[model samples]
Target: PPGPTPLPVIGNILQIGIKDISKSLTNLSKVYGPVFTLYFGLKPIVVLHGYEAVKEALIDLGEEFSGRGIFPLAERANRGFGIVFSNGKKWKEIRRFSLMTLRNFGMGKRSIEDRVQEEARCLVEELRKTKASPCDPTFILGCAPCNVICSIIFHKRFDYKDQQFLNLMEKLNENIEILSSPWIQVYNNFPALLDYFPGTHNKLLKNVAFMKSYILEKVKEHQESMDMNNPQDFIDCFLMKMEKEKHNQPSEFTIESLENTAVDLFGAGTETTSTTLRYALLLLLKHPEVTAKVQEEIERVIGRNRSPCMQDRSHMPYTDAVVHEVQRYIDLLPTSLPHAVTCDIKFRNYLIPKGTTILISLTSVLHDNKEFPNPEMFDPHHFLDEGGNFKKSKYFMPFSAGKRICVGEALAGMELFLFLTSILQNFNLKSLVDPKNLDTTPVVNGFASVPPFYQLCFIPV
Candidate 1:
C-alpha cells in the first residue's frame, strides 16, 4: 500500500521518468512491491504489478476491478458515452452490444476468417508488387487492418490509397502517437489547466473531432439507406437497435452513443492489431531462426498452394507459439488502459477505495520472469512445451483479461494468425541488415509501444 514519499504539489512526478513510465513503475515495484500507491500531482493511483498480483485484482476479483478509470484522452474523445471509457450501465450495454455485434459480423467465426483471408491476400499482392525491393511497410500494413474493420463496420473496404480512408488511418496513427507522448501524461495529471494551454492535446482532440464527424456522416448515410428487415453492417445494426428501443425509457442506443461507439470500434480495432503485427514482423526480422521454424511449420501445415486459415493454426503449433510470443514479448499497452474499482473492495488484503484509479501493469504480467524466465527476450520457446506443441500461459495477457478485456480480441487474434502466416507462406522475410544485427526494442514506449521503423525485403519463396 505504501510507495515512495512524494513532494507537495508536484507529487511523485520527478520520480516517475518522463520517457518510459512503465519501466520506471516496474523499477519502483521492485522496491515498494506490487499494489503500491504513487501520487501523480495531488492524486494517488494504485498500480498492480506481476502476474499473481494483477491476476488477483483483474481476474480473481474481476467484477470489482472491472470499472473503467478516467483516461484523459479517452474521456475527451468519448465523453463518457462509449464502450472503452464509460462505466456502469452504459459500459455494460455498449460492451455487450459490441461483442454480440462483432460476433454476428464474424468475430472468431468462419465468416470473419474469410474477410481476414481476403485482406491477407490483398496484402500479399501489394507486397508482391514491391518486387522484393527494400520497403518500409508501415503504410501498407496499416491499410490491411483498417480495411478489415471497415468491412465489418461499414460493410465496405477501402482502396489502399483512398483519400478519406488514408486520412482516417493517418488520424488514428497520429492520435495514438500523441496519446503515448509525455505531454499527454502531463495533460492527464492536470486536465483543467492544460485544457486551456496550447499543446499536442489540442491536436489529439482535433483528430478525434474529425473522426467523430466522419462516423456521424456514415451514420446519416446509413439512416437514409438502411432497411429494418435486414441490417447490413455494424452501423445499420445499431440503427435498428435504436429504432427498436426508441420508446424504452433512457435507452442507451442514441445517435451520439452510436457515433462514439463506432469511433471506439474503428480506432481500437485498427491500432492494436496493426501495431502488434508491425512489431511482430520486427521481432521476426530480429530472430530469423524463429521465422525459419515458423515458415517450416507453415510449409508443413498450410503449404504454398492455398491461403492460411484459422483451422491451420491448430495443425501449426510452432507458428501459433510464434504469434503468442510476439504479443507477449512486445507487451503492448504495458500499463493497460487504466482500470477502477466498482466499489470499495479488498484486493490482496488492501482496500481499493471506490473511484480510485488503478493501473494494472500488464507488462509485469506479460514479462513476469518467474512465469517466463529471461522474460525480456523474445523467444517463441517460451510458448512452446517440451513436445514442441503450443503452450498457453495465463501470464500471457496481451489482450488483457476479465470483463473489460478487448472487444476485438478474437478478431485481432484471427487477423494476426491469418495475416502473419499468409505473408510468410508466400514470401521469405529479409532484413536489410544481418538478422543478428537487427534491434527489436520499441521506438516509442509510452501508452502504446511501437516498433522502430525499418525496411525489409519480401523475397519470393
Candidate 2:
C-alpha cells in the first residue's frame, strides 16, 4: 500500500510536469524505484519499471493482467470497438482476425516484401529529388510505411500531394499529439466538467469522424468490386467473412467494427512505424560513421543493383544490429498500453487489486544496463556478440511482451529492416546542422516521445 502519496484533488498529476512524459517517467523510476504507484486524478495506476518488474507483471502473470487499460479519451472516441480498446471475446476475435488477415496480405512473405521494397525504392527516389539539400524527411519517411498498410488493407497507396490523404495523416498525428498531452489526462480525470468546455477532445473527435467516414467509403467501394471467389485485400476478406457468418449468428465483424478496425489499422499502423523511421533517419544523420558502416555492410550483402530484401538481413549482421539498436536507443513508446488486472494477484509481495491499471515501462527494460550495458549509449554492439552475429536479449521488448502485444509486429519489423537498408544503400545521410547540436531528446509532454522536427541531407551513394 506504500506508494507516492497523492494530494487532495490534483493527485499525482502534478508529478508529471508539462515536459516530455517519457523522460518524466524514467526520472520517476530512479526516485520511487520500479513498481511504484501513481494516480491520475482519482484513478490508481501502477507504474512497472525495469526488466524484472515489467517481465514478471506482464509476461509471468499474464493471465491476471489480461485486460487493457483504455485511455479515457480513446474509450470515449472509439467506444471500445476495435482490437486495441476491445476486451474479452471481442478482443480475441478481432486480434485473431487481424493477425490472420495481415499474414495473408504478405507479412514476412516474399509477396509482402515486394510491396515494401517497392515503396522503399519509391521513397528513395522521393528523397533523391531533394538533391542532398536540407529537407524534412518526416513526410517522405511517413509516406512509405503508411503506403505498405494502405496496399495491404485498401489495395492501393496514396500520392504525397493527395489532399485527402495529407489531411487524414495530419489528423491522425494531431490526435496522437492531443491524446498524449496533459490536457487529455485532465479531461479524463474530470469528464463531467471537461465535457462542457470546447477543446482538443472535440478536435480529436472530428479527426476520428473524418477517418471513420473515409473508411466507410472504402468499405462500400470494396463491397462493390471485391470478388467473392478470390478476395484481394483485408476489406475483401472481412466482407467475405461477414457474409459467411452473418447468416448464422451475430458476430463482432459488423459494419461498425469493420469501419473501426480499418481506422485502427490506418491510425496505429501508419503513425508508429513512420515515427520510428523518422527517428532512425535522424539518428543516422547524426552518426555518419554508424551510417557508413551500416551502408558498407548492406552494400556488401545487398548490392546497389538489386533492392534490399528481408532475407539479406541474415548476411548483413551489423546492418541488422544497427536497426535493432535504433529502436532500442530511441525507446519510442516508453509507457506502453497499460494492462488492467483481471483478478486480484500478488506480485513481488505486493497486492495488485482487480481492475487496477498496470503501466508497463518498456523503455526501462529496453534500456536496462544489465541486459544492454551502457544503456545511455546508442552502440549497436548490444545486439551483436564478439563474432558480429545478431543476438536477442531478454530485455529487448520494444513491442512489449504479453498476450496484448502489438499484432502488426512482423509487418512493422519487415518494413523497418527493408526501408533502413534500402535508404542506406541508395544515399549517404548528413545532418543539416552540426551533428553535435541536434536535439536527440524527444519533445516533452507528449504521448509518444518523437524526435523533434529536423532537416537532413541525403547525398547519392
Candidate 3:
C-alpha cells in the first residue's frame, strides 16, 4: 500500500533502480513502513526491511514464506533443478537431502572442520610462497575455500598451481560477477527481450553452460567408479541416494538434479565465504588499531608457537568479535536473495498472495543503526561487551535466517574464524596505503559486493 505507484507494462522498473537495490528498498521502507510490496517488471515482491519485519516472516512465520523466488534468468540458467533455484517439492526433496548430506559431513558424520583446518594449512603455505612480497588476497582467499569444498564434495584437493582447478575457479568467479551485474537484473525483468538480443548475458549463458558441463563430467566419473559400501564425499552420498530413488515412480534424484545440486554447493559455498574474508582483511587494514587488538587477542590466547584451533576461540573474545563485526560491516548479499511466499495469508494486515517474491534487506537488519551504532563504521565494539567478552546479537543474520538459511553456515563460520585467525597468527598484513585512506565500502553494488583489490605485504613476524 505504501510503495511507489508502478506504471503498467514496465511496472516499477524506473522507480526501483536495480542498480542500488539495497539503498532503493531501504528508502522505500521509510515511506511504506517495515512491510510493503514493490514490483519488478510485472512481478510483485514483498519488501521486508528492518529487523522485526524480517524476523517475523522468516522466523516467526517461516513456513509461510519458505518458497524460493523463481527469477527468469536463474530459473533458465539453473533449469529449475538445483537446491538454490528450485521451488516446492523439487526444492524440498533436494534441500532436505543436501542439508542432511552437508550436515553429515560438515557437522558430525565426518568433520568439515578438519577439511577447513587442512585447507587453512594449504592457504598458509600458498601465502608464504609470496616470500614477503605484495599479494592479492582475493584469489588466494577464494582458492582456500574451493579446496575445502572440493575435498568435501569431490573428495579431492588440487595443488595451488593445478591448471584444471584454477580454470574452474576462474569460471566460478566470472559466474559470480556476471550474475550480479546490472545487465543481469535487466534480463531478470525483461528476460524474453534480453534473450532475443545479445549482451553480456549471452556471455553469462555460455559461462553457465560450461559450469554445468564441468559438474556433469564429474558426476559421470563418480557413477563409473561407485563403491556402494563407502561414500567418499557429498557426491558419493548423493549418487547413492539417486540410485535408491531411481526406482521410485517419480524421483527428484536424477543426474541433472545431482549436477545442479553440486553447482549450488560450489557457487554458493566458494564466493560468499571468500568475499567476506577479503572484506575482513581490508577492514583490518583500514582499522589498524582493531588489527592490533585482534592480534593482541590472538597473541595472548594462542601464542605464535602453535596453530590457533577453533576450541581456542572461547578463550579469545575480541578476535571472535572482530570476525562477526566484519560480516556485519560488509553486509554482503544485502538483499539476502529473493524469498518467495509459499501460501497466501494475511500478514501484518497485508494479504500476500502465494508466489509473491519477498526481498529481505539484510543491510537494514545488520546496519540497523539503533542496534549497531554507527553501522557504517567498522567497529568491533558493536559485538563486544564492556567486560570484553563476545556478545551474540539477535540481529546477526549474515548466513540469513530460518529454515532456508545457508546450508553451509556452520562450515563457513568455522572457515572465517580459522582462516582469519590463522592468517593473523603467522603474518602482519601491512597495507601499502595509509590506514585512514583505505576504503572499506564495496567496490560493486549488487547481489553480492566484495572489497576493491588491495595488496597486502605479508611480512612474517
Candidate 4:
C-alpha cells in the first residue's frame, strides 16, 4: 500500500538493482512495512515480506491469491499454455491433471521411492568410479536428479555420459543461468522494447525453442509406438487423454499443451532439485561436524549394508532435519514464482485489484530471525528441538505455502533425502580447502540461489 516514490518509466529499477532482488525487497520491507508497492517499469508489483504478511496472503486467503501472475519470460517460453505460468481455466485443468498423473506415478508414494533409491544407487556408483579423486560434482549431481525425472516423463533414463543427454543437461543448466541474468530482468520489465534488441534474452528464447522441439520429437516417438491398453510414461498418459478428448470441444489435452506441459515438468523437475543437491553437498563439506552427525544417523538407523528408504526418514530425525535445513538455508526461489489475485481482493488495509502482480518474499519467511535464531548461519538445529526430534516450523516455506506451492515438493524431498543419504552413507566428503574457508554464499542470488562452485573428494567410508 505504501512504498518509495517512483520515478517516471524506469520506476524503482534504480532502487532495486538487477541482482539480489529478493534481498533488496526484503530490506525495503523494513522501511515500508510488510506490504509495499514498487514499480518495475510502469507496472505496480505488490511485495509481501515477513512471515505474517506472506502467511496471510498465500495461506490465510489461499484461493483468492492462487492465480498465476504475468511473468513475461515464462509467458514467452510457455505462451500461457502449461501449469507453471498459465492462468484460470487452463492452469486449473492442467495442474489438476498433472497432480493426478504424478500421484499415479507415485509422487509422495512408495512406487516413486523405489525410483529415487535406484537413482541414488546409480549416483553412488558414479562417485565410486571417481576413486576418491577430486571432482566438481556439478554434472554428476545434475545427472542423478535429471535421470529420475527422465524415468517418470520419458519412461527411460539416460546414461550419464550419453552425448544427447549431456547436451540437454548443459542447455538446461545454462538456461537457469540465463534466466537469472540481469539482461532477462531488464527484458522482463520492457519486453516489447527488448524484443527487437539482441542479448541473452535471445539466447534464452533459442534455448527454450530447442527444448520445445525436443519435447515435440518425444511426443512423435510416443505417438508411433504407444499402445492404448497400456500407457508407458507421462507422454503416453497424456496422449491417451488427448485421444479420448479429441472430440470434446476445446480440450486441454492438445499436442501443444502436451509439449509445453512436458517442458514444464522436465525443466521444473530437473534443475531445482539438482541445484539444491549440489548446494547441500557444498554445505555438508563446509560443516564436517554436521555431515558426521548425519552420517552417524544414517549408520545407526539404516546401516551401511542397505539403501536408504522413506521409511528410514521417520527413524532418522537428524538426517531429515539436515535435509530440511538445506532447503531453508539456501532459500531457493526466494521471491517465489509470481502470484496474482483471482479477483479484486481486500488485503490488509488496501484493496489489491484483480490481475495485479504479487511477490511473496519467501526469503523473508525462510530467514525470519524470531523463528530461526542466528538465521544467517546454516544449522540443522533450526529444524531440531530440545530432545533432538525433528521440529516443523510454519515459517519453513521453502516450497512456499498454500494453493500455488511447488508441485515437485514431495518428489524433491524424496530425491534430496535418498540421494543425500546414499552419498554420505558411502563416502566421507573431503573439501579442497579448509572447512572454514569454504563459502556457502550463493553466486547467483536472483530467481534461484546458485551455490558457489567447488571441488571435493568422496573418501570411501
Candidate 3 per-residue lDDT, tens place, 154-242, comes to: 77788978886888899888888777666677766777766586555566667767777887788788889978768878888888887
Query: Across residues 346-372, which tens digit of lDDT does each residue of candidate 1 receive?
Result: 877887799899999998888887888
Error of 3 at 88 (Å): 1.7
Clash pairs, candidate 2, are 19-444, 19-445, 20-444, 20-445
**Residue 104 lDDT (model 4):** 34
The whole-model C-alpha lDDT of candidate 3 against the native structure comes to 0.82
Q: Which should have the higher lDDT, number 1 or number 4?
A: 4
Clashing pairs in 3: none
What C-alpha lDDT values do all the predictions have?
0.83, 0.79, 0.82, 0.84
RMSD of 3: 2.0
Q: Which residue runs does candidate 3 get wrong by more than 4 Å? A: 104-110
Q: Give TM-scores for every candidate, taking all chains together and pairing residue i with residue i.
A: 0.95, 0.94, 0.94, 0.95
What tens digits encode model 4's per-residue C-alpha lDDT throughout 102-189? 7635332336667788899999999999999889998899889888877777877788888768877888888777676666777677
Per-residue error for 269 in candidate 2, Å, reads: 1.0
Number of backbone collisions per candidate, in order?
0, 4, 0, 0
